[PDB]
Every structure is written in C-alpha cells, then in structure tokens.
C-alpha cells in the first residue's frame, strides 16, 4: 500500500489539511450535506416512557475539494477509507432525543472519492421522544419523528438536503426512509404505514440559528393488536 | 477558510482556556444565564426527581477573543469548539443523579468584540421535594439551581438572561408538551449569597400542575 | 526485555494504521474470522433480541510488522495494543440495540512473520425473528451477520476460520439447547 500512503501524505501533509475548517473557499459559502436514513430495525416503542428506540444507518454525503486527487497520478486509486477524526465532519445530531445520546453510535471510516466526494455511513441506536396518542389503544397508530440537525453549524455554514437518486438518467430526491425489502425484519408489534422524509426550514428563525433548518424522518406506525385482543379484550368483554 | 484559519491562529496564540479572563486582578466576569425548555421529560415521584431536556444560554465577555473584522476579511464572528475557550464552570447544583455537566459541549459563538454565546444542550435530573398532600390533584414547585461550582462571586458574577424577561423560554411551536403536567409559572431569579467562597445562583422555577384524568378514571 | 523494546520502537517508527497492511494497494487483505460463543445470555421474544457473549477471533498478516528473531534476541512473538495497528472493521450488521463494532480493544499477538491474532470479547445483541407459533415448545434460528462495514471485497476479504462456530468454551444454558450451529 505504497500508493495510498503517498496519497494520504499528499492530501494531509503536503496540502496541510485542517479538519477544523469547513470545505469552503470563503466563509460566506455553505457546505451542502445530503442526508439519507436507512432503518435497520425498529427496536421498540415504549408507551409509558413514550420513547421510540430505533437502529438507523445515516448516509452523509458532502464535497471536500481539499480531498481531490488525480487517480492516474496515484496508482489508479479511486477511493480511500479514512478514520472520521482526520477529516472535517458535518456534525449532525438527533435533536429530539430524550436520553442525551445526541450522536451516532459507531464512528466508522469515511469513504473519500478522487473527485472530492466524502461518503459516510455511521450506524446508530437512537432513543427519541414520541408522544403517545392513547385514544384508540389498542387499535391506535402513532406518529414518531427523528429530527436531525447540527448544533455546531447553522444554515449560514451548512445546507441540509435530502439524498438524490437516479433512474433512466433522471435525478429525484429520496423523500422516504430507506428499508431493505429482504433484510428488514418487521417489528413484532408495529407495522410501518408511512415513512416520509422532509427538509424543514423555519422562515422566522435567523439564518445563524441552529433551529433554522433540519431534516425530519417520520414513522407512521400502526399497532398490530392481536396480542392485546386475544389476551385482554375477548376475556374482558366476555 | 484560510482567513478563518489565520484568525484562529492569531486568537489562540498564547491563549490558556483554563485561565479565567480578567485583564486586571479583581475584575469580575459577568455571566448571563438563561434556560430554554425543549421538553419536560417527567417528574418521578418515587425518586423525587424532575427530568428535563433544556438548552442553556450562557453569555460572557472574553477580552482575549477580540479582533478587528477589517483586518481579517470582514469576519465578524466565529464558531469554536467549547473546549478550546475558557468556559465558566456553570453546573446544576441540585442534580439528583450526580451529573453536573451538559450533554454535549458543541460550539461557542464568539463575536469580534469578545462576546461569547454558548447554548449547550442538557438532559438534567434535578432534585424536587414532592408535596404529596394533594396527590394526584397536586401542583409541584421544582427548581433548577445553576451556579459556578468553583469560582466565587468575586471572580464570576451571575445575572438572569434577557435582552427584561426573567422566565424560562419555551418556543411555542416546537415545545414537547407533557401529557401529565401543565406549566403554570416559569420564572427565573438571581439569588445572592447570604449577607470569600460566597456564590450567587440562578434558579429556574417550574410550577407544574398535574392533570389527574387517569386517576379519576382508574381509581 | 530490551530486545522487545527495541523491536517495538523499530516497528512503529514508519507505521500507519490507516493504510491497509499489504505490499501493494491492488492486493487484498486476507482476514480469517472465527466466532467463539461463550454464553447465550438471554433471548428477548418481545423486542426479538438475542444477547450473547462472544470472542471474535480475527487473523491476518501485516506486511510491515515483520522482523528476524535472530536480530532481536530470539523474540518470535510479542503483544501489541490493538489500537496502534490497522484492524478490520467488523460490524454486526443485524445488531439490535448493542454495540455495532468491537469496543473492547484488547492486545494482539504478533508473530515475527507478520501474522496477527486478535481475539477481542464482545456482547452481541442481535435481531432475531422470533416465531412464537409453537411457544414454549418453539425452535428458533438466530443469526449473527458480520462484515467489514467500510471495506468491500476488492480491498479486504474475510473468510471463515471453520465451518461451525467454536462452542468448546460454551456455558450451559438453563433455557435453551443449541442443536445446530454453522457459519456461511
């Protein structure tokens, strides 16, 4: 691995990479951060504590022009795996947590491509606030949300957007939580009806506020009432 | 951000984040303290503790972190990791679980005049003595006592945040309303020491009324 | 023990843990993975989580961490902190609510030939579809999917150490009997 040792030394030592500084030519510019969310599994929804526990893989994508190289000058290397603490990160956190765990669980390596694109897919176990509507329990449906923003950066420094996918050479936004049809195991009590994703911008807040922008991934989940039916309702009603 | 890099290099040359900013001996650092309540998580009567999610709002001046924007490409403000600058050791004194500090240090916003605004998040479990006499048709008076753990009033002076509203801020749209508790009052007060080692406090009070529908239906 | 000190100083003078440990970047790092199941801690049917105690044996050759024992007083093997070297980033893909990767960074046994053996412990909380149809006479089939999170097969290759998991040091369970076990 001579060649990527040369490339890492070229990027970080020769060009003097500074991860404290954002990847921008001027301060007034904003860094575009594209976010997607994959739901590995819905762990639980505790009604008494009103807490949604989820396992999510967060796909971050941005551009760092300082981390560009010509592939044929470096042995046709097209991608690098780097520890996330060498490079600048757009520190996204779960704003609406209810346990103090704002950050991702496992800080995996970033993937850096020769054309300057930084890809990062940290997984996380999140415990979020989900107020519970008990009106139709056990025939109820709940509307939980995972709100993602940056407390270290505002809309003046990073611009949050949704991931973009392609089909028939046509680009579209990914406006939903990604679920693998084969690898996903459904929760034993909750069935996902809707799973949208939205970029919410508050026009009232100033542009230098962390509360201006966020990306929210919603889970509309219907309870499967067979357990409660069989074990409570039929005995109680009879 | 080469200009920002030079500005940070200038600001942090010879800077010691463990040293309180005082241009002269005897100068007091005025720290304005305010609170935003993101969520009243719970009030556990068995443990006698109020669980809340908040954003602190700490404002103070550090003369060492001042610069002329004209000499630095018109940069009027910076966002800096909180561990890099001096912080006042403002903690929740009446925590119940032994956790004094904030949940995430995040970043301070430093203006060119030396003003520093820090808004860390915090998940706090504070002690609250439950008045059990009228439970579940009761109201409780749960306080969050914030103060410097080490510095005395001759070194760090506290004041209630405003700019004058002496209250806990609750954002109307984004507040997670508790299903069992209604916030009646939410003032904030500056408590002076009795009559160094003396220390002021900023106490944020939450007077909260229980909503007893569950106990009416079930008991 | 001065020979070992000199060797350890020599090895990590021009070492990088970011860089993959083979001679050419077009080569693939060959990692042998084995799983030892020490204890089946618990099966949670509600949240569908199997929690187990495991040792995740990982073996691979580091091209740059080689030496001649004759040059170092006959030292043929040493123990090195795992944080100091490149490692494969094995992740439990079907983790339910536990740790995704190894968090207990124990020491690695390094031979003079560059072969590294690293056997960290872990508590795996894995998501297992629980079929309650025949409960309490139910048979379950719970899996542990392991893979390099950020490295694909063209840069890092993982192979099983054995066809079956290592159950030699398995504690008896008061609730379950492992009839069959197999790694693919």
């Amino acid at each position: 691995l001579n060649e990527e040792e040369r490339l890492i030394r070229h990027l970080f030592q020769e060009k003097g990479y500074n991860k404290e500084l954002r990847p921008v030519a001027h301060k007034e510019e904003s860094v575009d951060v594209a976010l997607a969310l994959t739901l590995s599994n819905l762990i639980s929804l505790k009604e008494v504590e009103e807490t949604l526990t989820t396992n999510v893989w967060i796909e971050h994508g941005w551009t760092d022009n300082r981390l560009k190289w010509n592939a044929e000058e470096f042995g046709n290397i097209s991608v690098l795996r780097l520890p996330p603490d060498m490079v600048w990160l757009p520190e996204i956190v779960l704003e609406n947590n209810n346990d103090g765990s704002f950050q991702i669980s496992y800080s995996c390596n970033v993937l850096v491509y020769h054309y300057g694109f930084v890809y990062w897919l940290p997984p996380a176990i999140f415990r979020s606030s989900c107020p519970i509507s008990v009106t139709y329990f056990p025939f109820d449906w709940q509307n939980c949300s995972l709100k993602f923003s940056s407390l270290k950066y505002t809309a003046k420094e990073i611009t949050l957007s949704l991931k973009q996918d392609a089909k028939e050479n046509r680009t579209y936004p990914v406006e939903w939580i990604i679920i693998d049809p084969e690898g996903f195991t459904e929760n034993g009590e909750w069935e996902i009806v809707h799973r949208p994703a939205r970029v919410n911008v508050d026009p009232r807040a100033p542009l230098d506020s962390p509360s201006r922008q966020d990306i929210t991934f919603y889970l509309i989940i219907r309870r499967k009432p067979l357990f409660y039916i069989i074990n409570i309702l039929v005995p109680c009603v009879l | 951000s080469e200009a920002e890099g030079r500005l940070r290099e200038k600001l942090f040359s010879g800077y010691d984040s463990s040293v309180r900013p005082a241009r002269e001996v005897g100068d007091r650092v005025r720290v304005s303290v305010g609170l935003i309540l993101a969520q009243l998580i719970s009030l556990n009567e068995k443990d006698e503790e109020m669980s809340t999610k908040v954003y602190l709002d700490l404002e103070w001046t550090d003369y060492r972190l001042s610069w002329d924007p004209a000499e630095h490409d018109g940069i009027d403000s910076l966002r800096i990791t909180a561990e890099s600058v001096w912080l006042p050791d403002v903690v929740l004194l009446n925590n119940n679980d032994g956790n004094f500090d904030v949940a995430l240090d995040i970043s301070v916003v430093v203006s060119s005049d030396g003003s520093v605004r820090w808004q860390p998040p915090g998940i706090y479990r504070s002690s609250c003595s439950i008045q059990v006499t009228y439970f579940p048709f009761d109201w409780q008076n749960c306080t969050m006592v914030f103060s410097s753990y080490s510095y005395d009033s001759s070194e760090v002076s506290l004041q209630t945040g405003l700019g004058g509203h002496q209250e806990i801020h609750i954002h109307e749209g984004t507040f997670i309303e508790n299903g069992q508790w209604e916030i009646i009052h939410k003032p904030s007060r500056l408590i002076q020491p009795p009559g160094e080692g003396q220390r002021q406090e900023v106490i944020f009070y939450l007077i909260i009324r229980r909503k007893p529908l569950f106990y009416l239906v079930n008991v | 023990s001065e020979h070992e000190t000199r060797l350890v100083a020599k090895l990590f003078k021009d070492y990088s843990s970011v860089v993959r440990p083979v001679e050419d970047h077009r080569q693939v790092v060959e990692v042998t993975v084995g799983l030892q199941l020490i204890q089946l801690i618990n099966v949670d049917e509600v949240n569908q989580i199997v929690t187990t105690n495991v040792r995740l044996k990982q073996q691979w050759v580091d091209y740059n961490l080689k030496w001649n024992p004759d040059d170092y007083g006959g030292v043929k093997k040493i123990h090195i902190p795992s944080e100091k070297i490149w490692r494969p980033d094995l992740v439990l893909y079907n983790n339910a609510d536990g740790d995704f990767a190894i968090v207990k960074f124990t020491k690695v046994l390094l031979q003079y030939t560059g072969h590294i053996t690293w056997t960290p412990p872990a508590i795996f909380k894995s998501y297992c579809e629980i079929i309650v149809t025949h409960f309490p006479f139910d048979e379950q089939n719970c899996s542990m999917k392991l893979g390099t999170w950020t490295y694909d097969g063209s840069v890092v290759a993982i192979n099983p150490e054995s066809d079956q998991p290592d159950l030699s040091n398995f504690m008896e369970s008061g609730e379950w009997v492992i009839k069959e076990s197999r790694g693919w």
């Epitope: 030394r9 030592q13 020769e14 | 290099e9 | 021009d14 843990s17």
Partner: antibody, heavy 129, light 105 residues
C-alpha cells in the same frame, strides 16, 4: 503557491555576526518544521539546523552547535537564523526549506518523513577578512 | 554516513541511468533524492526512497531499503543533466555528496 524568500546575506568579516531571514507564504507556516541548509561554493548540500513548528525543539550541525541560533515568528511567517563567531568555512548559499513530512504528527496516523520539498532561491553569505 | 556512486556519469538522451547510494547503518526507508541544476535551488524528486513527488516526471524511479538505495532514470532528457543528491535522517539530517550527469559525446 508555496513560496520561500530568503534575505539578510552579504559580506561579513570573520568573528562578526549576521541574521538570515526567510519569509514564507502559501501555507500554514506554524504547522511545519523548518530547516536551514548551506551549500558552499562548488560543494554539496550540508544541513545547518532544524526548528519545530512552535520552536520548543531546535537542532544544529556539530560545526555550528554553539554558535548558531534558529528561531521563528509564526505571526509574521518568518524564520530566522542568528549566526555568531563566523569563519571562512561558513561562506555559502543558505537555503530555508519546509519539512512537509512533519505536518500533523500530533495525530497518531501520520509519522515523520524527510521531505524538504519547497526550497527558496537562497541567499549568499560571504565570510571574508 | 553516506556514500554515493558514481561521482560523475556521462550519457546521452534515451540511455538508462542508475545512481547508487549506501548508508553505513540501516536507515530503513528515510531517504530522499533531490535534483539541482546549476544556478538553481534543489528540487526534491523522491521521498521515502520510492515516493515520487506530485509534479515530477514518471521516468524517475526510486528503490532500496536498509543501507543500499538507488535512483533510476529510464530515459534521459536535456533537462535531466544535473547534480543529484541524496539525503537521510536517523536522528539528524545528512546529505550525501552529489553525483553529476553530463551529456556524452
């Protein structure tokens, strides 16, 4: 573009003193070790001295161990070399150069290499009586 | 200590050149190769004994480890006639006595 410009040379009598200066531009001056390297007329390159990024650590050649003093000012982006007890054997073109391999060594992922990549045009010092 | 060879080397355009360097003690890979044309400053060609600089032509190559190292020019060009130096680092920096490449006639 990375640039190093030297100055402060000329004719000095033996036993005197001189101050060589090197102005840097195009990179973070404080983040790199810096070296002074002399080339006598019609001879090869000879390393004079080395200074850390902050300036805590300094190193000198055996022939200039007690007579030279390397220093730096990161605010002005200026490397300096004070020379004392000059002799006729110190007549040379002096070069200031940046050690690229010393950047980011506080991180555990980067180790040092000798990578004197950018060199200034140099400045001539003539020690003669 | 450093020993370069040959002190002088005559060749023409298109010929292969190999300049050898020898250390009295094992310096592992801490070696750089520099080029210096007359009247100019040194230019680093290789660092760590095999790593080409970003802007250097690919004809230049570097090999060697421990004590024996070498610089190879596959095809000489008019701009490659210069004095080639080597430098090592064990605990201080030591340059080796240079070697000059001249046009052969």
């Amino acid at each position: 573009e990375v640039q190093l410009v030297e100055s402060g040379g000329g004719l000095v009598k033996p036993g005197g003193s001189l101050r060589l200066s090197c102005a840097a531009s195009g990179f973070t001056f404080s983040g790199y070790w810096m070296h002074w390297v002399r080339q006598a007329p019609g001879k090869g390159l000879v390393w004079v001295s080395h200074i850390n990024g902050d300036g805590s650590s300094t190193t000198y050649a055996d022939s200039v161990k007690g007579r030279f003093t390397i220093s730096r000012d990161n605010a002005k982006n200026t490397l300096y070399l004070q020379m004392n007890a000059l002799r006729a054997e110190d007549t040379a073109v002096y070069y200031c150069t940046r050690d690229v391999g010393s950047y980011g060594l506080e991180s555990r992922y980067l180790t040092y290499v000798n990578w004197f990549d950018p060199w200034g045009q140099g400045t001539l010092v003539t020690v003669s009586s | 200590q450093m020993t370069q060879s040959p002190s002088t080397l005559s060749a023409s355009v298109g010929d292969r050149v190999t300049i050898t360097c020898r250390a009295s003690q094992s310096i592992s890979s801490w070696l750089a190769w520099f080029q210096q044309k007359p009247g100019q400053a040194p230019k680093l060609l290789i660092y760590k004994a095999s790593s080409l600089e970003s802007g250097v032509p690919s004809r230049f190559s570097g090999s060697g480890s421990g004590t024996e190292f070498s610089l190879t020019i596959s095809s000489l060009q008019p701009d490659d006639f210069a004095t080639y130096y080597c430098q090592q680092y064990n605990t201080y920096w030591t340059f080796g006595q240079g070697t000059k490449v001249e046009i052969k006639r």
